[PDB]
Design a protein around this ligand. Structure first.
Ligand SMILES: [Mg+2]
Ligand SMILES: [Mg+2]
Lengths: 146, 147
């Protein structure tokens, strides 16, 4: 389901792990520095994400954390279908870029990451009244409720 | 702005702090166990929240964490207006605790149970049939406000 498909992947900065989720159909993202690239941390991130948006399918790579039994259980509980097997790469790249631009503006990396996410989701680039990723996701989900 | 107003407050369970945010106009909530009831943890939660939804005004009580300079800076950066000072946030904490109680056994840790509870609350429909869920009301409210 186009409105319920997300892609997850981990990227790294300053020796830290950043878990990233992208709503494919809109470009909206959610990211967060996790203490360790474990299935436990990944499962925790997934539950929060699923309680927020209609997460039906998550696409990830071969990563141990994503293939873990704990993430599997989280997905079954949340009714999320998994697929291990474009977009997420671009996001990690651009997220790192924005993080770079605002890095000085905050003490810890985790804060910079959230500033970057905010900037990315609020960012526009269409006409004088196009749409931001944040606006596209709610529009997509709203129109799908009817 | 009705669509941009949120209320935040902390509640407690098992000796832990649970930070809770409620989108007043829809009943949609976001909660999370934080290591400590500090301005730092509160500011972190607020940034995440603001990058997700159109947070324009946050209403909280007199709490040190909410009045802290670090939260103040977060709000200025995020362009969020603060107000210090109803029944809504109280009801949510109460019901969240209720749902947490119902699913407490399905999770290894409280923090997980909290997220299960949030998921259940936001997905819940009155009477379990038709109608709108809090999750659907918030996106509808925000969507109709974009036009
Ligand atoms: Mg990977
Ligand atoms: Mg309190």
């Amino acid at each position: 389901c186009s409105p319920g498909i997300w892609q997850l992947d981990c990227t790294h900065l300053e020796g830290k792990v950043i878990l990233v989720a992208v709503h494919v159909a809109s470009g909206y993202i959610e990211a967060e520095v996790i203490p360790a690239e474990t299935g436990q941390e990944t499962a925790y991130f997934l539950l929060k994400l699923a309680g927020r948006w209609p997460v039906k399918t998550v696409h990830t790579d071969n990563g141990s954390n994503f293939t873990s039994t704990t993430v599997k259980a989280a997905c079954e509980w949340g009714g999320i279908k998994q697929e291990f097997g474009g977009v997420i790469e671009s996001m990690n790249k651009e997220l790192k870029k924005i993080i770079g631009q605002v890095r000085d503006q905050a003490e810890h990396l985790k804060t910079a990451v959230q500033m970057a996410v905010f900037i990315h989701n609020k960012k526009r680039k269409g006409g004088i009244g196009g749409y931001s990723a944040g606006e596209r996701i709610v529009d997509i989900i709203a129109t799908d409720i009817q």
